[PDB]
Structure formats: C-alpha cells, structure tokens
Design a protein around this ligand. Structure first.
Ligand SMILES: Cc1cc2nc3c(=O)[nH]c(=O)nc-3n(C[C@H](O)[C@H](O)[C@H](O)COP(=O)(O)OP(=O)(O)OC[C@H]3O[C@@H](n4cnc5c(N)ncnc54)[C@H](O)[C@@H]3O)c2cc1C
Ligand SMILES: Cc1cc2nc3c(=O)[nH]c(=O)nc-3n(C[C@H](O)[C@H](O)[C@H](O)COP(=O)(O)OP(=O)(O)OC[C@H]3O[C@@H](n4cnc5c(N)ncnc54)[C@H](O)[C@@H]3O)c2cc1C
Ligand SMILES: NC(=O)C1=CN([C@@H]2O[C@H](COP(=O)(O)OP(=O)(O)OC[C@H]3O[C@@H](n4cnc5c(N)ncnc54)[C@H](OP(=O)(O)O)[C@@H]3O)[C@@H](O)[C@H]2O)C=CC1
Ligand SMILES: NC(=O)C1=CN([C@@H]2O[C@H](COP(=O)(O)OP(=O)(O)OC[C@H]3O[C@@H](n4cnc5c(N)ncnc54)[C@H](OP(=O)(O)O)[C@@H]3O)[C@@H](O)[C@H]2O)C=CC1
Lengths: 484, 484
C-alpha cells in the first residue's frame, strides 16, 4: 500500500535512512532484493556491507592475521605445535553464521521501528510508485511522497574474456563458498583484489594476483606500491602487467586461464582452481526503469546523478551510496548520508553531508590507512614549491621479538610548506591502520597544523605514536628510517 | 674532564637531551649508573623505559595477548592443538635479548654523536662539578656549564611490612627473572600493578592482585573500574581492600603473606611463590647531595622543584622526567622535554614543553586509553550543569567470531554542554587503546568540537570508528549499548 517514505535497497545506506526516518515518527517502508550472483549465490537483508564485503572480508582478513599471530606466538614463549593447519570450512561457517546474525538482526531493528519490509525486485512505474517482482511473482502497489534510492552496485565482469561468467567467481561468491578456493587467480589491482588476495594467501592458498596496470590507482602511489611489495614479499604470487583473454575449463575441471604478459612475453598459460574478478563494481540502475520515472542519470558510470542534498532531478526523490554519482563508495558515508538525509526531510535539519577528507583503510596483509591528500594530489593542488612532507620508517615493538620483517612499515604526512603548516593528508602503513588513522582524520576536519603535531605528545610504546614523531622532511632528503 | 653539557641519567629523557644537544654541535657528556635492585638485579644503559618498563612490559603484555590470539584462532579455522603451553624461559630470553638490542643501541648512538659516556654513580660536589663513584672506585673530575638532571626514580618499598625487602620483588625484577614467577601476589592498585598482574595472568600463572583502596586513583574512576572488572572476569584473582603486614618465608621457600581484609575479616593468610610491590616509585635525589649544590627540592615527593623552562634554582642547572616535580611521569614527555630543553639552550629555540592533554594508555588485559579530562575532573572544572558526555558499549568485529566477551568494551567522550561543544577528554577501553587514542589526542591539541566529530566520517569496520559514532548522552540517560 502507501507510505510517506519508500526506500529501495535494504543496504547500509538505505536501512540507515529508513530506521532514522522512522525514528522521526514517519511511516517508513523499504524494499530490498538480493538478485543472485552469476554463479547462483544469494544472501539475506543488509546490502553488500553485511553480506559480501565490509564484515566478511575483515573477518577473513582477521583469520589470516591470526595465522601470523601463531607463528609470532612461538617467539613469545608459546610452544604452539606447528605448522598449524586451517580449514576453509570452519572459517567460512563461523563468518557466515555471523553475517546471518546481522541478517536476522537488521530484520529485528526494522520491526521494533514501525517499518515494513517488502522483499521485492523494485522497479519504477512513475513519479510516486514502484512495481515489485517476487521470488513468486506477485507485484505490489507501493507509493510514497519521498523515495530514497540505495541500490548500490554489483561486481563488474570482463567483456570479451570468454570463459568468464562460465567459471569466473566474484567477491559475492568467495565469501559464501562451501569448499576452499584451493588455488586461485585474482584479476584486479585495487581494493577488492588485493584484500581478497591477501587473506587467501594468509590462509595458505596458492594465491596469484594479475594486475594489468598500476596498483590502487588513485591512492598515493608510493604507499600503493609499498603495499603490494609487502604482499609479494610475503607469499602472494604477482603477475605484473597481464590481462585475461580466455579461460578454458578442462577435464579435472581446473581452469586453464590464458593471458598476455605485456611486461615481457606475449601470452602465457597457467591453471588454477578458482578465478576471482576484482575489476570494479557497477550500479544496478538499469533494472529500475529510472528513465520512466524522471530520474536523470550519468553516462559513463550509470550512477544516479545527484544534488548536494542527495536529491535527484525529481526533488522528492533522492539517491544514496554506491548509487549516487560523485560520492565515495564507502559504508560510513553511505550510512551517515542516510541519517542526515532522513533528518533534513522530517527532522528540521539543514546540515548536509560533508564528503571531504573521509578516511579509509585498505585491509591488505599490511593495512594501509589514509585521510586527506596523497603527495601527488597535494602538489597537484598547491604545487611542489608550496608543500612539505614528513615521513618515517618504523618498527612495531611487537614486530621485534617475533622476527616479523617491517621494511614495509612506512608513514607519510603531507602538509603545506608555510607555517603553521596545515596537515592535509596522512598515510599510515602498518598494523591496524584504521584504528590509527581514525583519530587523525579528526585532526583534518579540524585543520590541525604540523605544529600541533610537534605539540602533541606520544603514547609510548605504540605504532600510532610514530605519526606524532615525524620530522624528517623530503625537502631535506634525509634518511627516513628512525633511530633512538 | 670538562664538557659544556653534563647529563645525569642515561635515560629516556636524559639521552634525548644529550643526543639532541650534541646534534646542536655541543660537547655533550652523560653519566648513568644502574644501582642494582634490592634483590640484586642490574641492567644496561637506557633508563627505566628500555630496561624495566615501557619496552619489556608491552612485550610481555604482547605475549599474553598472543595467548588469547591462539584461543580465538580456533574459531577462525585454525586447527591449533590446545591447550598450548608457554614457558617463562623462552619469553624472558626473547624480551631481554631485545632490551639489550636497545642497550648496545643507545651506546652506539652516543658514539656516532660526539658524546662521551661515563658510567658513574654521580653526586653533586658544587655548582659546576660532580663526583663519580665506580664499580671499581675511581672518582672522576666532571664539570660543565649546563647540567641536566634526569635520574628518574626507583620502585618504592613497604615500610613496617616485615618480610618485604627480604622476599619482595619489584618491577625491576619481574622482567629479568631467570625462572617463572610461578604463583604471585601483586600488592598494588594502579598502572604497574594491574599491567604486570595482567600479562602474568595471560601467561597462565595463578596471579592475585591486592588493592588496599581504589583502582588507578586519579583516572576516570568509571573507566578504572571497568578495567579491573575485565581482569577479574578473565582469570585475575582479586583481594579488594587488603593490606600487607607480614611475609614469612617457609621451608619450601614459599612466601607466607599475611594481610588484613578491611572489607570483611580482619586478617587472612595465603602463600605464593613471588610477591610484587607495585606501590609507586621514588626519586633518586637523595643520593646526589643536591643540597650541597644549591638545588632546592620538594618536601612530600623528593622530586627536584622546577621551572617552566625545566630550570631549577640554579639557572644553569635543569631537571627532566620522573625527577622534576609537577611533570607527568611518562616517557614521551621525558623525551620531548629533553629535546626542547636542548634546543632552547643551544638552538635559539623559545618554545617550551606543553604538558597538557598528554595522552596515555594503561596496557592492561583490556587496554585503557585516554586524553584530556575524566568525567569527574570535568564537572570539577566546569560544573555538571555545563558538561555533556557521550558514551558507548561496542563489540569489536574481531571479538565476534571468536566468542570473546566484550561487555567491558566501553567508550566515553567528555566535552562541554554548550556548542560547538569542545571535546576535552576521551576515554577508550578496548583493543589497542593507544593506537586509537593517539590520533584523537590531536583533536584535543586542536580543540576539536563534538560537531567536528559528527562531521568526521568513519573507517569501517574498526574499533576507533565507534568513537566518531558516539551520540547517546548521559543527560538523556539512554541505553549505551550500540545497535545497527
Ligand atoms: C569485498 C568488499 C569489501 C568492502 N569493505 C569495505 C570496508 O571495509 N569499509 C567500507 O567503508 N566499505 C567497504 N566496502 C564498500 C561498501 O560495502 C559499499 O560502499 C556500501 O555497501 C554501499 O552501500 P549502499 O547502501 O549504497 O548499497 P548496497 O549495500 O550495495 O545495498 C544495495 C541493496 O539493494 C539491493 N537492490 C539493488 N537493486 C534493487 C532493486 N531494483 N530492487 C530492490 N533491491 C535492489 C541489492 O541487491 C542490495 O541488497 C566493501 C565492498 C566490497 C565489495
Ligand atoms: C613497569 C613500568 C612500565 C612503564 N610503561 C610505560 C609506558 O608504556 N609508556 C610511558 O610513556 N611510560 C612508561 N613508564 C614510565 C617511564 O618509563 C618513565 O616515566 C621514564 O622512564 C622516566 O624517564 P627519566 O629519563 O626521567 O628516568 P629513568 O628512565 O628512570 O632513567 C634514570 C637513569 O639514571 C640513573 N641514575 C639515577 N640516579 C643516578 C645518579 N645519582 N648517578 C648516575 N645515574 C643515576 C638510573 O639508574 C637510570 O638508569 C613505565 C614505568 C614502569 C616502572
Ligand atoms: N574501504 C575499504 O576497505 C574497501 C572499499 N571498497 C570499495 O569498493 C570499490 C570496488 O573495489 P574494486 O572493484 O577493487 O575497485 P575499483 O577501485 O572498483 O576497481 C579498480 C581496479 O579494477 C581493475 N580493473 C578494471 N578493469 C579491469 C580489467 N578489465 N582487467 C583487469 N583489472 C581491471 C583496475 O585496474 P586499473 O586501475 O588499471 O584500471 C583496478 O585494479 C572500491 O573502489 C571501494 O570504493 C572495496 C574494498 C574495500
Ligand atoms: N604509561 C603507562 O602505560 C605506564 C606509566 N607508568 C608510570 O609509572 C608510575 C608508577 O606506577 P605505579 O607505581 O603503579 O603507580 P603510582 O601511580 O606510582 O602508584 C599508585 C598505586 O600504588 C598503590 N599503593 C601506594 N602505597 C601503597 C601501599 N602502602 N600498599 C598498597 N598499595 C599502595 C596505590 O594505592 P592508592 O591509590 O590506594 O594510594 C595505587 O594502586 C605511574 O604512576 C606512571 O606515571 C607505569 C606503568 C605504565
């Protein structure tokens, strides 16, 4: 029937807007539909975050870490008997049983909040209504004065790469597999690829990443590079500069993937058990008949063109998350953007969503955290003549007793050359990056100066303290590695 | 012979001033003497920090943590065979071999820096000179135009408690023991006590803490309490409200410690293998003949009375660290205070040492981090009518798959009730507190407002992000535990 607020996408962003909009006392209702993955994989309410990303990854990334924890453990006097095995079955179960705890968890929060849920592959019929396909097939007359679109996106697939859909697997699958990936190839060079490639290796699987160009394109290339080098230096096979052209399933069912070594040879063939495409995601806008509702869109990325109020072309219709063009594809921003929107509508709020200096963390074997600008983006904006950079190479105290190599533990603080020297970008690469970066992202929102950093005392002995020690400049070109 | 800068105490603070003062091109020289512990324990150059504290603790605290890492490990699919043992011998060696790496490490940095080292139990003879006892006995004529005193302190002992010096042990020993503490009693209720009590328990030792009054007196009592409760809830035997009166070594050499249960009974006796006095430290000023040099002092705490330039009564003589009265007994402050001092003297610097809002972290089983004010200190200064407090109870994503209880994971952000609402105290109690707190201590130096926190986006999924989510006020008295 009719509601004064319809939300499309029971996701991290959508749900936020939904629950917060209901808490404002409004008749909220959301429709979410988990259209299966090409390999036939489905999950519960809670968008990408809960089910195929944020939560599972971290959790598997965790299990990987634990592995090194055991190795290290021996040095600290723990007579653990090695080499300790690890089965994909036990882990996956554990993880999944938790995803579900957030499945039948959002569902609970939606009931106690005067909000109705309609599991239906929504689609636009006009200005204020949507049609609802079903696992069965009964459509449903749904209308609301305000419609928020939070449909996120889905794992993009290769084009001419024959043998793709056929045998490829996506981030949407790796998490719910019933049986170990065994051997695997990760065709990607950024966030997903690397992170997945990471724990896979951490588990003990013969993992191999296939970068066509540069790593984490966009990020502070220095840090980006330091990241991969850590992986390669720690068990992750790397095929720098190669692209897929054909995958052929053979008798034993193993995959015979053939590529091109643009770096050296001109074609090479290897075979692996699984193949993971980490080549970006794509908005699920097509499947909405947006055009037949009045919602203008974007050409390149099919995202929903947007306002600054998260509004679209239809002032009573909005978009949030991976869906809205121009916005950072994260979860916090998805969520926050939801609350605020739901408050500006029925809360008398005017504060908009601030998308600047949002921090982030690449949960790779060695976590890479950052906020603000990267050295490049920095000269790009103020010029190399007006930028100062302080960096350091530290050694976690914990990395010492355990003979864990730390030549990858780097830190880079980009700020302006002219006093007080407003810091405008921090880069941390070591253990628990997010845990460290978070605090500092506050210094940015505040415009903390390099002074206030030399004025900030340290919490010894920690890894984050290294940030607040930074003094060696690149101008000075002094040796970065830290003494004392 | 003569030098233009003499430093007393080859410690975290002293050495800093020393090396930095030499880097300014001055003829620096330092004299450090590790007068053994009552139980005959000695170590190398590097003050308390390196040898009996900062570094070792953390390292042993680490080994403890690793233990829970293995337990947890099982849930993430790591078929580790339990229960895994752990021997005090292997750990201690490892740790110590590292302490030494910082022993013959500062020593190296002192050579390459044009600085002479004179291992001599220094003592004041007058204005510009000191005498130097030796492991042998040859005094040494040492003079300098500027003398920095960084003698730190030493573990205080009980008074009338007979059987103390006799069998007691201090933080200075627990680290260098050759054989496992076995069973142990920790007479203390703050930093040292709890931290030591912590890993001891984490190792598997039958550890027991004996608090005479309240925990971490000074700290935000709420947090302080939450801390102990975690310990007690996780293996640490606790004797709330008891005091030592007699320890009697018996045949098997076990210690028969008799106390008084001021909470209930009026005397009780138990026996343990080791007894650790964590009842504060004391300045080693006495042994300097300070008075016979012109350095006025303090009555209660025998610390060296000080300036704001770290200067004493003798304008060419200064004091730093655990030695100088009024200053926070940490290491970073010790170190920073050293550099600055050495720059104001021979660097043309005027910036003084800022001792406000120095962050800190109690490395207990559950790390308690904080900066700024504690709720109490806060009402105390602005009044309960002008203070706002936001708190939360979170659950580390990592604590979920592993069935690790998190009813102790709390967070408290104290700021003013009136917008923008300058945050003036943060409290984090969970994993890697320092790693999390550090960043935020920058927000304080900057005066970040509760707004800039609601404006700061989060790094999901992390523990620190919870801070930047905080919204439930105590004014409102809403249920703290977090949903979604
Ligand atoms: C492997 C991986 C790891 C990640 N890790 C992190 C991390 O650590 N931190 C972080 O901040 N971000 C992370 N992200 C990204 C983050 O999860 C997304 O940015 C966020 O989920 C986007 O939120 P959303 O609400 O816009 O959409 P989504 O969460 O994608 O939800 C959209 C929902 O709507 C449904 N839907 C789509 N079309 C329709 C329709 N027509 N009718 C009905 N329902 C429909 C979908 O099936 C889905 O359930 C990760 C992503 C991946 C892939
Ligand atoms: C168990 C424990 C754990 C700790 N953990 C931390 C932590 O995690 N973080 C933190 O910030 N702080 C920590 N601290 C406190 C920190 O170590 C001290 O605040 C800091 O070491 C003080 O520095 P200092 O230079 O003043 O003196 P010290 O480091 O104590 O050095 C003084 C040196 O001078 C020598 N000396 C004394 N008198 C004479 C004399 N007359 N002649 C010659 N030499 C002399 C001493 O024997 C010693 O070597 C810890 C302390 C303990 C006990
Ligand atoms: N906060 C976090 O921790 C995480 C956030 N996310 C979010 O989800 C998004 C999706 O992740 P992801 O898909 O990995 O990254 P996008 O950043 O989505 O994808 C970029 C990667 O895909 C590669 N790629 C694109 N096309 C091809 C192709 N045809 N063959 C091979 N490689 C190709 C890129 O190469 P090139 O650069 O050479 O074009 C690059 O390595 C992220 O951008 C981020 O917004 C995901 C994981 C974690
Ligand atoms: N940054 C960090 O992580 C660390 C810093 N440190 C520093 O070193 C200092 C020394 O630590 P610590 O000695 O533990 O603490 P102080 O804070 O030095 O000592 C306070 C503790 O000793 C107890 N105590 C004092 N006298 C007695 C007695 N007669 N019987 C029983 N208990 C007694 C106190 O009880 P009550 O309060 O009831 O008087 C309290 O529990 C710290 O204060 C801190 O500056 C030490 C460890 C870690």
């Amino acid at each position: 029937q009719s509601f004064d607020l319809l939300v499309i996408g029971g996701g991290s962003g959508g749900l936020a807007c939904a629950k917060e909009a209901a808490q404002l006392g409004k008749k909220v209702a959301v429709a979410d539909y988990v259209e299966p993955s090409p390999r036939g994989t489905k999950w519960g309410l809670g968008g990408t975050c809960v089910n195929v990303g944020c939560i599972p990854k971290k959790l598997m990334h965790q299990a990987a870490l634990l592995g090194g924890m055991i190795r290290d453990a021996h040095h600290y006097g723990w007579e653990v008997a090695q080499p300790v095995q690890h089965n994909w079955k036990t882990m996956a179960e554990a993880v999944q049983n938790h995803v579900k705890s957030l499945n039948w968890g959002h569902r609970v929060q939606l009931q106690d909040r005067k909000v109705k849920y309609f599991n239906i592959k929504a689609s636009f019929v006009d200005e204020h209504t949507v049609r609802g396909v079903d696992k069965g097939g009964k459509a449903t007359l749904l209308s609301a004065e305000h419609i928020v679109i939070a449909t996120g996106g889905r794992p993009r697939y290769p084009t001419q790469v024959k043998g793709a859909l056929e045998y490829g697997i996506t981030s949407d699958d790796i998490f719910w597999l019933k049986e170990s990936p065994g051997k695997t190839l990760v065709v990607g060079a950024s966030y997903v690829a690397l992170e997945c490639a990471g724990f896979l290796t951490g588990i003990g699987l013969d993992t191999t990443v296939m970068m066509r160009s540069i790593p984490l394109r966009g990020f502070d290339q220095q840090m980006s590079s330091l990241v991969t080098e850590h992986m390669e230096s720690h068990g992750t096979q790397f095929l720098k500069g190669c692209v897929p052209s054909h995958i052929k399933k053979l008798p034993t069912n193993q995959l015979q993937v053939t590529w091109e070594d643009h770096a050296s040879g001109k074609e090479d063939t290897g075979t692996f058990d699984t193949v993971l495409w980490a080549i970006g995601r794509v908005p699920e806008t097509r499947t909405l008949n947006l055009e037949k509702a009045g919602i203008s869109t974007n050409p390149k990325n099919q995202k929903i063109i947007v306002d600054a109020q998260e509004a679209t072309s239809v002032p009573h219709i909005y978009a949030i998350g991976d869906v809205a063009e121009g916005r950072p594809e994260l979860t916090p921003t998805a969520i926050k953007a939801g609350k605020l929107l739901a408050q500006r509508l029925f809360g008398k709020s005017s504060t908009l969503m601030d998308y600047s200096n949002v921090p982030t963390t690449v949960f790779t074997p060695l976590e890479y955290g950052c906020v603000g600008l990267s050295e490049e983006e920095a000269v790009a904006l103020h010029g190399q003549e007006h930028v100062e950079v302080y960096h350091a190479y530290y050694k976690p105290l914990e990395f010492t007793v355990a003979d864990r190599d730390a030549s990858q533990c780097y830190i880079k603080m980009v700020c302006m050359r002219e006093p007080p020297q407003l810091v405008l970008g921090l880069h941390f690469l070591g253990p628990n990056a997010g845990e460290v970066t978070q605090g500092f992202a506050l210094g940015i929102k505040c415009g903390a100066s390099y002074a206030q950093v030399m004025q900030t005392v340290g919490i010894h002995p920690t890894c984050s303290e290294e940030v607040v020690k930074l003094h060696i400049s690149k101008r000075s070109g002094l040796e970065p590695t830290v003494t004392g």
